[PDB]
Amino acid sequence: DLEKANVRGARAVIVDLESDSETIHCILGIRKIDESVRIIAEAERYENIEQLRMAGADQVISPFVISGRLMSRSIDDGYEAMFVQDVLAEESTRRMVEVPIPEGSKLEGVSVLDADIHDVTGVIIIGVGRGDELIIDPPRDYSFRAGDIILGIGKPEEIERLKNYISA
Amino acid sequence: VPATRILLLVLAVIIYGTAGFHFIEGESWTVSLYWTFVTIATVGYGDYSPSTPLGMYFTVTLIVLGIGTFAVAVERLLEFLISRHVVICGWSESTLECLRELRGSEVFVLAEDENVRKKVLRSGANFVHGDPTRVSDLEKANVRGARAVIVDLESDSETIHCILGIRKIDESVRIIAEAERYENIEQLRMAGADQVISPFVISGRLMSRSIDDGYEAMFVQDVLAEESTRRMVEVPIPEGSKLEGVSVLDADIHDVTGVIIIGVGRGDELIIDPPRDYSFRAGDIILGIGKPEEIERLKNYISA
Amino acid sequence: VPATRILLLVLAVIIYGTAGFHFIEGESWTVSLYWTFVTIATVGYGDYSPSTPLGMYFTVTLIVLGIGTFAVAVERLLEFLISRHVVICGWSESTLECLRELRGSEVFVLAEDENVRKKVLRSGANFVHGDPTRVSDLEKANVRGARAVIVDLESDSETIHCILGIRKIDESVRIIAEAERYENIEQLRMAGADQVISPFVISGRLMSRSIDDGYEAMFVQDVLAEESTRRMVEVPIPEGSKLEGVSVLDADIHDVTGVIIIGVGRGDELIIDPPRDYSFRAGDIILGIGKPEEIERLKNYISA
Amino acid sequence: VPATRILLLVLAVIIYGTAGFHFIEGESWTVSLYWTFVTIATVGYGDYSPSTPLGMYFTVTLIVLGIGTFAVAVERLLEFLISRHVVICGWSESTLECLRELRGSEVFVLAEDENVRKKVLRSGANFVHGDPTRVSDLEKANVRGARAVIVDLESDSETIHCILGIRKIDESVRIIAEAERYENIEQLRMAGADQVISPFVISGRLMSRSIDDGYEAMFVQDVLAEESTRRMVEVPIPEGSKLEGVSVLDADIHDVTGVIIIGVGRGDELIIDPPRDYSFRAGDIILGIGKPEEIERLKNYISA
Amino acid sequence: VPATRILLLVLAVIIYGTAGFHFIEGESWTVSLYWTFVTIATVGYGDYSPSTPLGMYFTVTLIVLGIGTFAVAVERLLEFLISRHVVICGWSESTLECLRELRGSEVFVLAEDENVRKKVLRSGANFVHGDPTRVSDLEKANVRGARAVIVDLESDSETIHCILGIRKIDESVRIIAEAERYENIEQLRMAGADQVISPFVISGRLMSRSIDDGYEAMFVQDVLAEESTRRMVEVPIPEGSKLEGVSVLDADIHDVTGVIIIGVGRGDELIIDPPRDYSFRAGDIILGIGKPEEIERLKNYISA
């Protein structure tokens, strides 16, 4: 019944079943068929995240851990929960985006201090990602590479200015 | 048997014994009271004892009627001799991780299931048995003196009922509710919750944004964890600081400190990525991301 | 162990101790009996005690055989020592509010469920476990001597069945029933109910008369609540009163007393807004609304 | 704790107390033993008591080590000092009326529900908790030594399972089963029930024959009741009677006695309204209807 | 109540009584301490007793506060004065028969239900309440030191989850699983099970091979039952035996010993009906069927 639903030709599989044992079983059944498809799982318990990542899921998203950490941090004032719940909605004025660095750009080897993204463009640079790691608030000696992913927050005019600023 | 009834029964035995000994044996009221206690407790010093046949018969009756009554009374007596807090209504996984993050504070848990008391007492929180929708059981768990109430019940109807019960008790306490469905967010805000945290909407948007590459989910689940090098903390601008009237363009907080100023909040409104001519005030809550050394440097920079 | 067997065992110990002390130590039968109680109860005054080696050995045997036996006997004894009524058949919300207003009297609640025992005993009524449709379980709850029986069961067929059972037991008691549907009011009155109260018909009529403005529902739910200023009282006309044979036009109750005469009743009939030619009799019940000062003025007005 | 170990512990306390009092206070071994019992039992007459500081300290140690030990010892001692039947599997209304008709005989009841023990013990039958389909619980209820087992379970599958369990235990006992459906009669006979009583088939045929006038249902429900003047009893023809070889046409039992001979049975076969040339034997069971005077006359007529 | 707290409470009573008697009645500290013990133990010799009204009142207070406290203290004191295991995860029929054959060893049954405790303790195993999928509830049941873990849960996903948890705890223990479907045997072996037993595949193959005549099912269910005459035994070849380097054609086990050589095993492989050129080694396991006399003859045959 997995091979019914075209897992081989797919580009991403999202696994959210009724329990976590069923999620690990379905992830093993998916990895039986296509060993390179992207799997996004969902952990119903905190202990099972390393098991869901060992079983084969590329990205594990645990909603109850995020909910508990946003509940415990909103006792005083909930600016963090407001930030998290408002940056994700595709209706607001500011958007969190991923902008890739093309080959032949103007920022090969350029450090983030000399690049000066926030004053020139207006995009808040919260992280520079590469491969399967994300470096949140990178230090000033961080030299860019062609192939890095810049994760930022800004108005879409600032996003267009950032794409035109890093363009080759 | 209710403790108060046992109290009356033992008092009646005491009156019976004291009056009987006084009238039959002719000892004073005080001696007779003392003799009655000594006898029904089975101490029996023998400094006083009946010397008449009637007194002997009476004493046997007091022994039979009084020793058991006194024994039950003493055992019942044994039982009675032997910032603010946070109240949690309902038991789920979200409240479990919230209770993990709330160590060092006094936490009550109001839940209907009796067989969760072991995990509530192991997590470090006092368990209060009851129904969270009922006002009397809400009241017992000290909703009045709390600083925040966290409501996570099975459905949204019970959550709205709990929020309205808490608003019937205390109109000033903080309610943090959790939405199970998307459309009930505005209704949970209408009932009186101060902030509604909808976890399945966040999870669905992260699962939708994690198709190409999952940097957003990594960012959220990393900065919410208090284990990384960078921490999301809110610094307040104190009364009488160097930053009143100064815009963020004149400030350059990321240039002088190294924290990433991702938002400035006032009251219950937050503006993410504020524009350059946004004038700072005293009381605006700065939401930033940085190392704790940068956090202490930011506190020293915005000082009075 | 059956209580009666424990009784025999303790009596046997008492005989053994009394005869032994009498024969070995030479004290009177009465002193020996008293000494036996004092000893096996572990009181031990010491006014009497053995003075011979045989008596000492005997006393140790009595201690071993008697103290445990007496202890078990007293604890078993503990268990046995430790207008007219109203019977309520079934447990629901209507009987709950009826029990809330009926404080001070003796109420026996007859119900099938055993888990309602704690809430019945906390509301202030003696719980009688049974089936309200069975005749034997009705006779267990003392229906014969009661002054009213309130029937409210799960369906309407069960209510007619319980009414038929009570009428098989007693042909004079007052039965109050609750109808679930409008069609069964005549069947409940034919089966023997002295008054049928239909809550859903009242609720539907109030919900349909509350569309424009709901002063009818406010009037009903304010004069039935015993916390408001005005109360709906029934004031009976005594024999030999001043108002035997006067019309209600000539009597003029409202201006002289302050009460509002909404109706008068006789036997099992009621005349709402009685016309001016209605001549009063003795024994009539006056249904009125007023402040309790006006109620006492009306009561002093209709005196003999 | 094993009783014998408690015995050793109390003996050790007794040795400790007796030797201590003898050596410290200088009383005789016998007095010291007596004092030890009086003290550890908490009797405390005070005829003997310590008079030295060492004796006082020692006595407090004996009190602490000895009173609990003696208490546990006496309570353990307390414990040591202090035709055939019919088994019914399952509890229904049919078994309730069967148990009403079976007064004076020893009846076991094997049922799964624990909350029927009160009505089983009130009806006059011993209650055995268990599952009737399991062979161990079938065995406990003494199926081996019974004379008849009556099976009335919730369905026909459980009834057939119970019949096969009883046939696994005893192949000679009598099983009386009840069919809930019509088509399972031959299967309940295949499993091993000696007679299958299908009540809904009898009820349906009486309800079908009672449309015009209900004389058949009146006849059945009247002659089965042991309250009418006529009774359906089975008389056996004894060995060596006057009726062997004599046909019913030569007999004229209704002419000489007045009973109505409605059937003659042999073994497990019954022929209702037998023809005139049916030759009687010795051992044929005559099924008749008549008054008990006619029954005694019929017994005197067919005698040896 | 913790024993140490009860200790403090009784010490506090002792201080209260001793100081009170000393100051009110004027006896020495030692006599006052002794009197306090004699009184709160309810011994009451009467060698010392209060002689003033204040002392009498005080004594009644000590009696009430002290007798219960002392009683609880002595009972608490009473308490202080007076190969490797196999873990079974889940409870079903297969684990029940496995527990029936595994008598003599130590078995820890880990199960979610609490009502299986009595049948687990009656089958002869220590019950450990928990969830077999959780890692902490696995580590509670001592999986680390066991010699085999038997996993049989409700579904196959739960079985794979429990196997992954045990492999996270221990990488050397032997895991035996039970497959519900034929597709999950390879997933259970990849997840880490040392042996997967599929009962439904064996049952389906035996039911399909029992159409013509069922000698296969009789063979399997007779050689697995340890009540028959023949037993299926594994006989290991020791180091230094007489059969190192001989073929099975030249060894000729069956005529000289009487056993039937159905297969030989090495490591984790098995060769059923091994060909005649198979040369024996040391450490090989011989799987055979025979009478125990033939088994002992084979064991003496393969000696060093």
Curated annotation (Swiss-Prot), chain A:
GO terms for biological process: potassium ion transport. The chain holds residues 169 to 336 of 336 of the full protein. Ca(2+) binds at D16, E42, E44. GO terms for cellular component: plasma membrane. The keyword Transmembrane helix applies. GO terms for molecular function: identical protein binding; metal ion binding; monoatomic cation transmembrane transporter activity. It is a multi-pass membrane protein. Residues 84-168 form the RCK C-terminal domain. The channel is composed of 4 repeated units, each containing a transmembrane pore part and a gating ring part. The gating ring is composed of eight identical RCK (Regulators of K conductance) domains, in an alternating arrangement of one domain from each of the four subunits and four from the intracellular solution. Two protein interfaces between dimers of RCK domains from the pore-forming subunit and from the intracellular solution hold the ring together. One is called the fixed interface and the other the flexible interface. The flexible interface forms a cleft where calcium binds. It comes from the Archaea. It is found in: Cell membrane. The gene is mthK. This is Calcium-gated potassium channel MthK. The keyword Transmembrane helix applies. Its main location: membrane. It comes from Methanothermobacter thermautotrophicus (strain ATCC 29096 / DSM 1053 / JCM 10044 / NBRC 100330 / Delta H). Calcium-gated potassium channel. Keywords: Calcium, Cell membrane, Ion channel, Ion transport, Membrane, Metal-binding, Potassium, Potassium transport, Transmembrane, Transmembrane helix, Transport. It is not known whether calcium is the physiological ligand. Homotetramer.
